[PDB]
Amino acid sequence: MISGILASPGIAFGKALLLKEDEIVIDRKKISADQVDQEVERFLSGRAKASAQLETIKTKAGETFGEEKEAIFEGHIMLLEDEELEQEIIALIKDKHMTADAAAHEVIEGQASALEELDDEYLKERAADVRDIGKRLLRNILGLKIIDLSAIQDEVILVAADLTPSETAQLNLKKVLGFITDAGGRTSHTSIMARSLELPAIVGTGSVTSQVKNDDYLILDAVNNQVYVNPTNEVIDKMRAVQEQVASEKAELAKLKDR
């Protein structure tokens, strides 16, 4: 029924884990020069904690995937610590009387769009990854709670509209049975996890997030390029017997020493 882009072959059974996030709202109220000083404290000080949180996550990406991926995350921190970009954010708040949350969004609006003008797979992806850095900063300035996705205790299927490199770097690969999100797929970061880990995965879910609720029973086939939602027990019993026989055949390919 739902056919995605099929990233890795395999079959898994598990409950649906739906991740819900609170939307970020920007305040468009214009402040006067009297409150501008207060915004610098929230931004200057918030920058203090943001650098720390991002700095800790950088090690997780290096300890999870190795120094090969740590270099990419290290570059993101440099953008935030660029003394040039910092001066621009400050100037907008004092020159255009904008809030710290609003001023920061304007700089990120062009840094991200500008990278899209490049025709390189790395520079283009940096455009999407850089946008994520701005959203994270906004959540810190407003004191929004952070969801700790690495606190999962039950192995289930992970379902989400999309995951950003930072969230994927801190994800626990041993507690997730597979990844199923509505992400493009061609050279997508999610596909990289699947290709490196060879675990079954799908990304072209399209709008499954709007049709699945937490606790739904879903079967990932990763074979016929389709997912079953709310299957009847009659079908599950038929697939459990025949589907498991398929697993035994796959073991013969790994046992090349018996031929």
Contact 183, 164 (CB under 8 A): no
> Other C-beta atoms within 10 Å of 101: how many?
22
Cα–Cα distance, 167 to 172 (Å, whole number): 10
Class of domain 3-20+147-249: alpha beta
SS3 101: helix
Cα–Cα distance, 106 to 214 (Å, whole number): 36
Residue 76 annotated among the catalytic residues of the structure: no
Residues for the chain: how many in total?
259
- Cα dihedral: 69, 17, 194, 196 (round 10): 50
Elucidation technique: NMR
Q: Hey, what are 196's tokens?
A: 């490196």
Q: Give the angle 150-153-156 at the CA atoms, nearest 5°.
A: 90
3-state helix, strand, coil in the chain (%, to 5): 55, 10, 30
Q: Hey, what are 47's tokens?
A: 């920058």
At a CB cut-off of 8 Å and minimum separation 6, what does 85 contact?
79, 107, 111
What is the CATH architecture of 21-146?
A: Orthogonal Bundle (1.10)
Q: Choosing from 76, 97, 105, 189, which is the catalytic residue?
A: 189
Contact 148, 168 (CB under 8 A): no
172 φ, ψ (degrees, to nearest 5): -95, 115
> Other C-beta atoms within 10 Å of 99: how many?
23
Domain ranges (residues) in the chain: 3-20+147-249, 21-146
